Design a protein around this ligand. Structure first.
Ligand SMILES: *[C@@H]1O[C@H](CO)[C@@H](O[C@@H]2O[C@H](CO)[C@@H](O)[C@H](O)[C@H]2NC(C)=O)[C@H](O)[C@H]1NC(C)=O
Ligand SMILES: *[C@@H]1O[C@H](CO)[C@@H](O[C@@H]2O[C@H](CO)[C@@H](O)[C@H](O)[C@H]2NC(C)=O)[C@H](O)[C@H]1NC(C)=O
Ligand SMILES: *[C@@H]1O[C@H](CO)[C@@H](O)[C@H](O)[C@H]1NC(C)=O
Ligand SMILES: C[C@@H](N)[C@H](O)c1ccccc1
Ligand SMILES: [Fe+3]
Ligand SMILES: [Zn+2]
Ligand SMILES: [Zn+2]
Lengths: 335, 6
Protein backbone atom coordinates (compact mmCIF):
# COMPACT_ATOMS: atom_id res chain seq x y z
CA UNK A 1 0.00 0.00 0.00
CA UNK A 2 0.96 3.63 -0.73
CA UNK A 3 -0.47 6.84 -2.23
CA UNK A 4 -2.02 6.73 -5.70
CA UNK A 5 -1.29 9.78 -7.81
CA UNK A 6 -4.28 10.53 -10.05
CA UNK A 7 -3.90 12.56 -13.22
CA UNK A 8 -6.43 15.32 -13.76
CA UNK A 9 -6.99 16.73 -17.23
CA UNK A 10 -7.43 20.49 -16.99
CA UNK A 11 -8.16 22.86 -14.04
CA UNK A 12 -11.70 21.71 -13.27
CA UNK A 13 -10.70 18.06 -12.91
CA UNK A 14 -7.71 19.26 -10.89
CA UNK A 15 -10.06 20.98 -8.47
CA UNK A 16 -12.24 17.89 -8.06
CA UNK A 17 -9.12 15.80 -7.64
CA UNK A 18 -7.86 18.10 -4.91
CA UNK A 19 -11.15 17.73 -3.02
CA UNK A 20 -10.90 13.95 -3.39
CA UNK A 21 -7.27 14.07 -2.22
CA UNK A 22 -8.25 16.09 0.84
CA UNK A 23 -11.15 13.77 1.75
CA UNK A 24 -9.01 10.67 1.22
CA UNK A 25 -6.44 11.99 3.66
CA UNK A 26 -3.88 12.02 0.86
CA UNK A 27 -4.41 8.37 0.03
CA UNK A 28 -4.87 9.85 -3.41
CA UNK A 29 -2.94 12.91 -4.54
CA UNK A 30 -3.06 14.84 -7.80
CA UNK A 31 -0.97 15.53 -10.85
CA UNK A 32 -2.53 17.65 -13.55
CA UNK A 33 -1.92 18.10 -17.26
CA UNK A 34 -3.60 20.08 -20.06
CA UNK A 35 -4.54 17.08 -22.18
CA UNK A 36 -5.28 13.40 -21.81
CA UNK A 37 -2.21 12.59 -23.90
CA UNK A 38 -0.05 14.64 -21.52
CA UNK A 39 -1.55 12.71 -18.61
CA UNK A 40 -0.74 9.46 -20.43
CA UNK A 41 2.86 10.66 -20.62
CA UNK A 42 3.00 11.56 -16.92
CA UNK A 43 1.86 8.03 -16.13
CA UNK A 44 4.45 6.55 -18.50
CA UNK A 45 7.14 8.59 -16.73
CA UNK A 46 5.85 7.34 -13.37
CA UNK A 47 4.95 10.87 -12.30
CA UNK A 48 1.28 9.93 -12.02
CA UNK A 49 -0.26 6.50 -11.36
CA UNK A 50 -3.56 6.49 -13.18
CA UNK A 51 -6.58 8.09 -14.78
CA UNK A 52 -9.92 7.07 -16.27
CA UNK A 53 -9.96 6.99 -20.09
CA UNK A 54 -12.32 6.84 -23.03
CA UNK A 55 -11.73 3.81 -25.26
CA UNK A 56 -9.88 5.73 -27.96
CA UNK A 57 -7.42 6.98 -25.35
CA UNK A 58 -7.07 3.47 -23.91
CA UNK A 59 -5.82 2.50 -27.37
CA UNK A 60 -3.11 5.19 -27.17
CA UNK A 61 -2.21 4.27 -23.61
CA UNK A 62 -2.22 0.55 -24.39
CA UNK A 63 0.11 0.96 -27.32
CA UNK A 64 2.48 2.56 -24.83
CA UNK A 65 2.21 -0.30 -22.35
CA UNK A 66 -0.43 0.92 -19.92
CA UNK A 67 -3.10 -1.57 -18.88
CA UNK A 68 -6.80 -1.39 -18.02
CA UNK A 69 -7.45 -1.74 -14.26
CA UNK A 70 -11.16 -1.25 -13.54
CA UNK A 71 -14.00 -0.19 -15.82
CA UNK A 72 -16.84 2.29 -15.32
CA UNK A 73 -20.14 0.46 -14.78
CA UNK A 74 -23.41 2.44 -15.06
CA UNK A 75 -26.94 1.75 -13.81
CA UNK A 76 -27.08 -1.80 -15.13
CA UNK A 77 -29.08 -2.39 -18.30
CA UNK A 78 -29.14 -6.16 -17.90
CA UNK A 79 -31.40 -7.09 -14.96
CA UNK A 80 -28.61 -8.67 -12.90
CA UNK A 81 -28.10 -10.80 -9.78
CA UNK A 82 -24.52 -9.66 -9.09
CA UNK A 83 -22.97 -6.63 -7.35
CA UNK A 84 -21.90 -3.67 -9.51
CA UNK A 85 -18.19 -4.26 -8.87
CA UNK A 86 -18.49 -7.85 -10.16
CA UNK A 87 -20.98 -7.14 -12.97
CA UNK A 88 -19.57 -7.30 -16.52
CA UNK A 89 -19.67 -3.99 -18.38
CA UNK A 90 -22.01 -3.80 -21.41
CA UNK A 91 -20.69 -0.87 -23.41
CA UNK A 92 -22.37 2.36 -24.36
CA UNK A 93 -24.18 3.36 -27.53
CA UNK A 94 -22.38 5.75 -29.83
CA UNK A 95 -24.98 7.84 -31.64
CA UNK A 96 -25.28 10.74 -34.08
CA UNK A 97 -27.78 13.34 -32.87
CA UNK A 98 -29.49 16.17 -34.76
CA UNK A 99 -32.34 18.62 -34.20
CA UNK A 100 -35.73 17.29 -35.27
CA UNK A 101 -36.36 20.67 -36.90
CA UNK A 102 -33.31 20.17 -39.14
CA UNK A 103 -35.57 18.07 -41.37
CA UNK A 104 -33.53 17.14 -44.46
CA UNK A 105 -30.60 15.76 -42.44
CA UNK A 106 -29.73 12.04 -42.40
CA UNK A 107 -26.59 9.96 -42.21
CA UNK A 108 -26.45 10.26 -46.00
CA UNK A 109 -26.56 14.07 -46.20
CA UNK A 110 -23.91 14.84 -43.57
CA UNK A 111 -21.32 16.09 -46.05
CA UNK A 112 -20.60 19.83 -45.76
CA UNK A 113 -22.69 20.17 -42.61
CA UNK A 114 -21.40 21.42 -39.24
CA UNK A 115 -20.33 18.81 -36.66
CA UNK A 116 -19.76 18.60 -32.92
CA UNK A 117 -17.30 16.00 -31.54
CA UNK A 118 -16.36 15.10 -27.97
CA UNK A 119 -12.70 15.29 -28.96
CA UNK A 120 -10.34 13.94 -31.61
CA UNK A 121 -9.38 10.32 -30.83
CA UNK A 122 -12.37 9.57 -28.60
CA UNK A 123 -14.67 6.61 -29.37
CA UNK A 124 -18.19 7.98 -29.95
CA UNK A 125 -17.08 11.51 -30.72
CA UNK A 126 -14.45 10.59 -33.29
CA UNK A 127 -13.14 7.07 -34.01
CA UNK A 128 -16.53 5.54 -34.75
CA UNK A 129 -18.08 8.32 -36.85
CA UNK A 130 -14.93 9.30 -38.77
CA UNK A 131 -13.95 5.68 -39.28
CA UNK A 132 -17.37 5.06 -40.81
CA UNK A 133 -17.23 8.22 -42.91
CA UNK A 134 -13.70 7.56 -44.18
CA UNK A 135 -14.75 4.06 -45.12
CA UNK A 136 -17.92 5.12 -46.90
CA UNK A 137 -16.36 8.05 -48.74
CA UNK A 138 -13.35 5.92 -49.59
CA UNK A 139 -11.35 9.00 -48.65
CA UNK A 140 -8.88 9.84 -45.88
CA UNK A 141 -9.68 13.57 -46.08
CA UNK A 142 -11.93 13.44 -43.02
CA UNK A 143 -10.80 17.00 -42.32
CA UNK A 144 -12.65 18.15 -45.43
CA UNK A 145 -15.91 16.22 -45.00
CA UNK A 146 -17.74 18.63 -42.68
CA UNK A 147 -17.67 22.35 -43.54
CA UNK A 148 -16.85 23.32 -39.95
CA UNK A 149 -16.58 21.45 -36.65
CA UNK A 150 -15.62 21.59 -33.03
CA UNK A 151 -13.31 18.65 -32.53
CA UNK A 152 -11.21 19.46 -29.44
CA UNK A 153 -7.63 18.44 -30.02
CA UNK A 154 -7.40 19.35 -33.69
CA UNK A 155 -5.41 22.29 -35.12
CA UNK A 156 -7.00 25.47 -33.62
CA UNK A 157 -6.75 27.31 -36.94
CA UNK A 158 -8.36 24.47 -38.91
CA UNK A 159 -11.98 23.93 -39.94
CA UNK A 160 -12.12 21.14 -37.36
CA UNK A 161 -11.85 23.75 -34.62
CA UNK A 162 -13.82 26.56 -36.23
CA UNK A 163 -16.90 25.89 -34.08
CA UNK A 164 -15.13 25.50 -30.74
CA UNK A 165 -15.59 28.39 -28.29
CA UNK A 166 -12.79 28.15 -25.70
CA UNK A 167 -13.34 29.15 -22.04
CA UNK A 168 -15.26 31.99 -20.36
CA UNK A 169 -12.66 34.51 -21.51
CA UNK A 170 -12.67 33.01 -24.98
CA UNK A 171 -9.21 31.51 -24.41
CA UNK A 172 -8.09 27.93 -25.04
CA UNK A 173 -10.27 27.49 -28.11
CA UNK A 174 -10.31 23.78 -29.07
CA UNK A 175 -8.25 22.53 -26.12
CA UNK A 176 -9.18 18.92 -25.34
CA UNK A 177 -10.21 19.50 -21.72
CA UNK A 178 -13.31 20.82 -19.93
CA UNK A 179 -12.26 24.48 -20.29
CA UNK A 180 -13.43 24.28 -23.90
CA UNK A 181 -17.17 24.99 -23.79
CA UNK A 182 -17.95 22.26 -26.34
CA UNK A 183 -15.61 19.58 -24.97
CA UNK A 184 -16.67 16.04 -24.14
CA UNK A 185 -20.10 14.43 -24.25
CA UNK A 186 -21.93 17.35 -22.68
CA UNK A 187 -19.94 19.96 -24.60
CA UNK A 188 -20.59 18.35 -27.98
CA UNK A 189 -24.27 17.92 -27.15
CA UNK A 190 -24.37 21.58 -26.07
CA UNK A 191 -22.80 22.49 -29.40
CA UNK A 192 -25.79 20.80 -31.03
CA UNK A 193 -28.38 22.19 -28.60
CA UNK A 194 -27.24 25.78 -29.25
CA UNK A 195 -27.32 25.03 -32.97
CA UNK A 196 -23.65 25.79 -33.43
CA UNK A 197 -23.48 22.42 -35.13
CA UNK A 198 -25.89 20.31 -37.21
CA UNK A 199 -24.91 16.97 -35.67
CA UNK A 200 -23.29 15.85 -32.44
CA UNK A 201 -21.41 12.58 -32.04
CA UNK A 202 -21.93 11.47 -28.45
CA UNK A 203 -23.47 8.52 -26.66
CA UNK A 204 -27.10 7.62 -25.97
CA UNK A 205 -26.90 8.47 -22.34
CA UNK A 206 -25.77 12.07 -23.01
CA UNK A 207 -29.02 13.02 -24.75
CA UNK A 208 -31.16 11.66 -21.89
CA UNK A 209 -29.11 13.20 -19.11
CA UNK A 210 -29.29 16.69 -20.62
CA UNK A 211 -32.96 16.91 -21.60
CA UNK A 212 -36.41 17.02 -20.02
CA UNK A 213 -35.15 18.48 -16.76
CA UNK A 214 -32.38 15.97 -16.09
CA UNK A 215 -29.94 18.91 -16.16
CA UNK A 216 -30.72 22.25 -14.54
CA UNK A 217 -27.79 23.89 -16.32
CA UNK A 218 -28.93 27.03 -18.15
CA UNK A 219 -28.31 25.78 -21.73
CA UNK A 220 -29.93 22.43 -20.96
CA UNK A 221 -32.84 23.18 -18.60
CA UNK A 222 -35.24 23.76 -21.53
CA UNK A 223 -34.15 20.98 -23.85
CA UNK A 224 -36.86 18.50 -24.81
CA UNK A 225 -36.04 15.01 -26.12
CA UNK A 226 -38.77 15.25 -28.73
CA UNK A 227 -36.79 18.08 -30.30
CA UNK A 228 -33.96 15.65 -31.13
CA UNK A 229 -33.50 12.71 -33.51
CA UNK A 230 -30.89 9.99 -33.97
CA UNK A 231 -29.33 9.29 -37.34
CA UNK A 232 -29.29 5.57 -38.15
CA UNK A 233 -26.77 4.07 -40.57
CA UNK A 234 -29.51 2.97 -42.98
CA UNK A 235 -30.38 6.61 -43.66
CA UNK A 236 -33.42 6.81 -41.38
CA UNK A 237 -34.04 9.11 -38.41
CA UNK A 238 -35.46 7.92 -35.10
CA UNK A 239 -36.63 9.29 -31.74
CA UNK A 240 -33.89 9.24 -29.10
CA UNK A 241 -35.79 6.42 -27.37
CA UNK A 242 -34.69 4.07 -30.15
CA UNK A 243 -30.91 4.19 -29.64
CA UNK A 244 -30.90 0.36 -29.45
CA UNK A 245 -31.93 0.17 -33.05
CA UNK A 246 -30.30 3.36 -34.21
CA UNK A 247 -26.66 3.70 -33.10
CA UNK A 248 -23.31 3.81 -34.89
CA UNK A 249 -21.67 1.25 -32.62
CA UNK A 250 -21.32 -0.16 -29.12
CA UNK A 251 -18.34 1.42 -27.41
CA UNK A 252 -16.20 -0.09 -24.70
CA UNK A 253 -16.80 1.54 -21.28
CA UNK A 254 -14.32 4.14 -20.12
CA UNK A 255 -11.77 2.54 -17.84
CA UNK A 256 -8.93 3.29 -15.45
CA UNK A 257 -5.44 2.61 -16.82
CA UNK A 258 -2.09 2.54 -15.09
CA UNK A 259 1.37 1.17 -15.54
CA UNK A 260 1.38 -2.59 -15.35
CA UNK A 261 3.74 -2.50 -12.37
CA UNK A 262 1.29 -0.28 -10.43
CA UNK A 263 -2.00 -1.90 -11.55
CA UNK A 264 -2.57 -4.17 -8.55
CA UNK A 265 -1.99 -1.32 -6.13
CA UNK A 266 -4.09 1.21 -8.03
CA UNK A 267 -6.94 -1.32 -8.09
CA UNK A 268 -6.72 -1.92 -4.34
CA UNK A 269 -6.89 1.77 -3.50
CA UNK A 270 -9.72 2.52 -5.94
CA UNK A 271 -11.91 -0.30 -4.69
CA UNK A 272 -11.50 1.16 -1.20
CA UNK A 273 -11.98 4.74 -2.37
CA UNK A 274 -15.32 3.95 -3.97
CA UNK A 275 -16.52 2.19 -0.83
CA UNK A 276 -16.07 5.62 0.75
CA UNK A 277 -17.06 8.05 -2.01
CA UNK A 278 -18.84 6.04 -4.68
CA UNK A 279 -22.59 5.48 -4.95
CA UNK A 280 -23.94 4.67 -1.47
CA UNK A 281 -20.38 5.25 -0.30
CA UNK A 282 -19.88 5.84 3.42
CA UNK A 283 -19.02 9.50 2.82
CA UNK A 284 -21.12 10.35 -0.24
CA UNK A 285 -23.10 12.66 -0.30
CA UNK A 286 -22.11 14.01 3.16
CA UNK A 287 -18.44 14.65 2.31
CA UNK A 288 -17.50 13.80 -1.28
CA UNK A 289 -18.97 11.93 -4.22
CA UNK A 290 -16.39 10.57 -6.64
CA UNK A 291 -18.92 10.10 -9.45
CA UNK A 292 -20.58 13.53 -9.33
CA UNK A 293 -19.54 16.88 -10.83
CA UNK A 294 -22.79 18.52 -11.93
CA UNK A 295 -22.97 16.78 -15.34
CA UNK A 296 -19.45 17.89 -16.22
CA UNK A 297 -18.18 14.30 -16.08
CA UNK A 298 -14.96 15.23 -14.27
CA UNK A 299 -12.53 12.33 -13.67
CA UNK A 300 -15.41 9.88 -14.16
CA UNK A 301 -18.69 10.01 -16.03
CA UNK A 302 -21.41 11.24 -13.69
CA UNK A 303 -23.60 8.25 -14.55
CA UNK A 304 -21.06 5.79 -13.14
CA UNK A 305 -22.49 3.47 -10.48
CA UNK A 306 -19.13 1.89 -9.67
CA UNK A 307 -15.76 0.85 -11.03
CA UNK A 308 -15.91 -2.85 -11.91
CA UNK A 309 -13.26 -5.55 -11.79
CA UNK A 310 -12.34 -6.85 -15.22
CA UNK A 311 -12.79 -10.44 -16.31
CA UNK A 312 -9.76 -12.35 -17.53
CA UNK A 313 -7.09 -9.75 -16.71
CA UNK A 314 -7.54 -8.37 -20.25
CA UNK A 315 -4.80 -6.70 -22.24
CA UNK A 316 -5.87 -3.37 -23.70
CA UNK A 317 -6.65 -5.10 -27.00
CA UNK A 318 -8.87 -7.68 -25.30
CA UNK A 319 -10.62 -4.98 -23.27
CA UNK A 320 -11.31 -2.86 -26.35
CA UNK A 321 -12.22 -5.82 -28.55
CA UNK A 322 -10.51 -6.86 -31.78
CA UNK A 323 -13.04 -5.14 -34.08
CA UNK A 324 -12.66 -1.71 -32.45
CA UNK A 325 -8.88 -2.06 -32.28
CA UNK A 326 -8.78 -2.77 -36.01
CA UNK A 327 -11.23 0.05 -36.69
CA UNK A 328 -8.90 2.48 -34.90
CA UNK A 329 -5.87 1.01 -36.67
CA UNK A 330 -7.54 1.50 -40.04
CA UNK A 331 -8.54 5.10 -39.30
CA UNK A 332 -5.07 5.91 -37.97
CA UNK A 333 -3.73 5.03 -41.44
CA UNK A 334 -5.17 8.34 -42.58
CA UNK A 335 -2.96 10.42 -40.27
CA UNK B 1 0.83 2.51 -36.93
CA UNK B 2 1.98 0.02 -34.26
CA UNK B 3 4.45 1.40 -31.67
CA UNK B 4 3.95 3.99 -28.89
CA UNK B 5 3.01 7.42 -30.26
CA UNK B 6 5.37 8.88 -27.65
C1 LIG C 1 -30.03 5.43 -22.96
O1 LIG C 1 -29.73 6.20 -21.84
C2 LIG C 1 -30.72 6.41 -20.86
C3 LIG C 1 -30.13 7.28 -19.79
O2 LIG C 1 -28.96 6.66 -19.31
C4 LIG C 1 -31.26 5.13 -20.25
O3 LIG C 1 -32.24 5.43 -19.21
C5 LIG C 1 -31.85 5.18 -17.87
O4 LIG C 1 -32.12 3.77 -17.94
C6 LIG C 1 -32.17 3.21 -16.61
C7 LIG C 1 -31.99 1.71 -16.70
O5 LIG C 1 -32.48 1.17 -17.92
C8 LIG C 1 -33.40 3.75 -15.89
O6 LIG C 1 -33.50 3.18 -14.59
C9 LIG C 1 -33.26 5.29 -15.79
O7 LIG C 1 -34.42 5.85 -15.20
C10 LIG C 1 -32.99 5.93 -17.17
N1 LIG C 1 -32.56 7.31 -16.98
C11 LIG C 1 -33.23 8.34 -17.48
C12 LIG C 1 -32.65 9.71 -17.15
O8 LIG C 1 -34.25 8.25 -18.17
C13 LIG C 1 -31.78 4.36 -21.45
O9 LIG C 1 -32.19 3.07 -21.09
C14 LIG C 1 -30.66 4.15 -22.47
N2 LIG C 1 -31.15 3.42 -23.59
C15 LIG C 1 -30.48 2.42 -24.09
C16 LIG C 1 -31.03 1.79 -25.29
O10 LIG C 1 -29.48 2.03 -23.60
C1 LIG D 1 -13.54 0.39 -42.02
O1 LIG D 1 -13.21 -0.62 -42.93
C2 LIG D 1 -12.24 -1.55 -42.52
C3 LIG D 1 -12.02 -2.52 -43.66
O2 LIG D 1 -13.14 -3.39 -43.77
C4 LIG D 1 -12.73 -2.34 -41.34
O3 LIG D 1 -11.63 -3.16 -40.98
C5 LIG D 1 -11.92 -4.56 -41.13
O4 LIG D 1 -12.67 -5.05 -40.05
C6 LIG D 1 -13.03 -6.41 -40.23
C7 LIG D 1 -14.16 -6.71 -39.26
O5 LIG D 1 -13.77 -6.39 -37.94
C8 LIG D 1 -11.77 -7.26 -40.09
O6 LIG D 1 -11.95 -8.68 -40.16
C9 LIG D 1 -10.84 -6.85 -41.20
O7 LIG D 1 -9.59 -7.50 -41.02
C10 LIG D 1 -10.62 -5.35 -41.21
N1 LIG D 1 -9.90 -5.03 -42.41
C11 LIG D 1 -8.69 -4.53 -42.41
C12 LIG D 1 -8.29 -3.87 -43.68
O8 LIG D 1 -7.95 -4.60 -41.48
C13 LIG D 1 -13.07 -1.38 -40.23
O9 LIG D 1 -13.66 -2.07 -39.14
C14 LIG D 1 -14.00 -0.27 -40.74
N2 LIG D 1 -14.10 0.77 -39.78
C15 LIG D 1 -15.20 0.94 -39.13
C16 LIG D 1 -15.14 1.91 -38.02
O10 LIG D 1 -16.19 0.32 -39.40
C1 LIG E 1 -6.24 6.03 3.86
O1 LIG E 1 -5.53 4.88 3.53
C2 LIG E 1 -5.14 4.05 4.61
C3 LIG E 1 -4.43 2.83 4.05
O2 LIG E 1 -5.39 1.91 3.52
C4 LIG E 1 -6.36 3.57 5.36
O3 LIG E 1 -5.94 2.88 6.54
C5 LIG E 1 -7.23 4.75 5.72
O4 LIG E 1 -8.41 4.21 6.32
C6 LIG E 1 -7.53 5.53 4.44
N1 LIG E 1 -8.39 6.65 4.68
C7 LIG E 1 -9.15 7.25 3.77
C8 LIG E 1 -10.07 8.25 4.39
O5 LIG E 1 -9.12 7.03 2.57
C1 LIG F 1 -15.39 -5.59 -25.91
C2 LIG F 1 -15.20 -6.42 -24.66
N1 LIG F 1 -13.99 -7.21 -24.80
C3 LIG F 1 -15.05 -5.50 -23.41
O1 LIG F 1 -14.70 -6.24 -22.29
C4 LIG F 1 -16.13 -4.48 -22.97
C5 LIG F 1 -17.55 -4.66 -22.96
C6 LIG F 1 -18.46 -3.68 -22.52
C7 LIG F 1 -17.95 -2.45 -22.05
C8 LIG F 1 -16.57 -2.22 -22.02
C9 LIG F 1 -15.70 -3.23 -22.47
FE1 LIG G 1 -16.33 7.66 -24.67
ZN1 LIG H 1 -25.44 -2.54 -32.75
ZN1 LIG I 1 -6.33 -12.49 -22.08
Amino acid sequence: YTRVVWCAVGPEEQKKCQQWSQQSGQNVTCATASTTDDCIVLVLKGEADALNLDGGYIYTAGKCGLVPVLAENRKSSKHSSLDCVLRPTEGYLAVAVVKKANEGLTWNSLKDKKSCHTAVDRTAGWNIPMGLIVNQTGSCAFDEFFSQSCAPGADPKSRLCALCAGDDQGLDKCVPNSKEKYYGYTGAFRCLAEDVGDVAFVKNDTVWENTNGESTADWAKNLKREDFRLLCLDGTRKPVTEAQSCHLAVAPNHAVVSRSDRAAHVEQVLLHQQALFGKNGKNCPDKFCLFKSETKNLLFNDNTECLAKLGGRPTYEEYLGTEYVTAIANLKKCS
Amino acid sequence: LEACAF
